[PDB]
Design a protein around this ligand. Structure first.
Ligand SMILES: Cn1ncc(C(=O)N2CCC2)c1C(=O)Nc1cc2nc(-c3ccccc3)cn2cc1C#N
Ligand SMILES: [Mg+2]
Ligand SMILES: [Zn+2]
Length: 313
């Protein structure tokens, strides 16, 4: 109970900032997550023994893939930590509990392949889950781990609170299906601009949490340029492997996944910042003004990709 996690001075200070990188020391990531749960939620939110056992089982069920790995999970959780900490009063006790867990679990058992590839492969998961295939799997893996003996971190919650938090987690994980992001943001934009956005409306809260999940999931574009650039390498390492596997099925992959078209990556990133990232952080900043640093960092990285195209690097 009187056992706080404490980080070294540089991490203690920089972990509060949106652009924090969790670093290359894998063994410190569990402790970083617990630290964030303690400050974001409270030292009482979870039994430390159950939480630690949950974290280590989640880690074990992330795979050794270039991008959709345990580091991504903790990175996405930290961005949620920064949003929650800069929006103290806007979120319920159950939301703060569920959302850091949702982020840690949101890509559980990812193989480094898109929903499209599972469907074209005719993977069993595509028969079990026709839409948001991997995201329904991620939620299923989250429930599986929560039901392991000594892993039920929500055991103190009432039966109705337990159902509410698992519903927050399910919606939050489904929302990380980028196919659903476009429509979600359009609705939020209209609601904000016609002034009809109401944070007491549960359907509205659900939409806002969805956008937070997209924002956290894409947060590689909100880091300092060297982090953004080196993360982009891991992303394309997966995309190009999927492209190779598409070619093995006798299907020409989209250019994004074709390693023969490495040259077009800079222009591909511009499209991504303009069509997905900038719109995402703009709408998020309109709804949650203290998240503006994410939009500012995103714009800085768009400018860096423009410089790459002009051969200034
Ligand atoms: C940074 N970031 N973080 C997440 C994602 C992402 O999607 N994720 C995570 C799993 C799903 C990205 C990303 O980079 N996304 C895209 C890159 C891209 N390159 C080209 C491209 C076209 C032509 C030629 C070469 C590349 C097209 N593109 C479309 C994209 C989208 N959407
Ligand atoms: Mg995902
Ligand atoms: Zn993710």
């Amino acid at each position: 109970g009187l056992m706080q996690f404490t980080l070294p001075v540089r991490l203690c200070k920089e972990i509060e900032l949106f652009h924090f990188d969790i670093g290359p020391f894998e063994n410190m990531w569990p402790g970083i997550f617990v630290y964030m749960v303690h400050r974001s939620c409270g030292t009482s939110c979870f039994e430390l023994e159950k939480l630690c056992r949950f974290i280590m089982s989640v880690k074990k069920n992330y795979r050794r893939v270039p991008y959709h790995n345990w580091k991504h999970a903790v990175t996405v959780a930290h961005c949620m930590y920064a949003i929650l900490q800069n929006n103290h009063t806007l979120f319920t006790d159950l939301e703060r509990k569920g959302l850091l867990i949702a982020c840690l679990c949101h890509d559980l058992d990812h193989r480094g392949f898109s929903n499209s590839y599972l469907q074209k492969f005719d993977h069993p998961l595509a028969a079990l889950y026709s839409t948001s295939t991997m995201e329904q799997h991620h939620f299923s893996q989250t429930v599986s781990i929560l039901q392991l003996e000594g892993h039920n971190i929500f055991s103190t919650l009432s039966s109705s609170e337990y159902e509410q938090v698992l519903e927050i987690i399910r919606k939050a994980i489904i929302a990380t299906d980028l196919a659903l992001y476009f429509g979600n943001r359009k609705q939020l934009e209209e609601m904000y601009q016609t002034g009809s956005l109401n944070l007491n409306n549960q359907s509205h809260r659900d939409r806002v949490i969805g956008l937070m999940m997209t924002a956290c999931d894409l947060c590689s574009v909100t880091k300092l340029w060297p982090v953004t650039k080196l993360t982009a390498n891991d992303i394309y390492a997966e995309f190009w492997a999927e492209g190779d596997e598409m070619k093995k099925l006798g299907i020409q992959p989209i250019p994004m996944m074709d390693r023969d078209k490495k040259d077009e990556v800079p222009q591909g990133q511009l499209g991504f910042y303009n069509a997905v990232a900038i719109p995402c952080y703009t709408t998020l900043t309109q709804i949650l003004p203290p998240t503006e640093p994410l939009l500012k960092a995103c714009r800085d990285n768009l400018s860096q990709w423009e410089k790459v195209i002009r051969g200034e690097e």
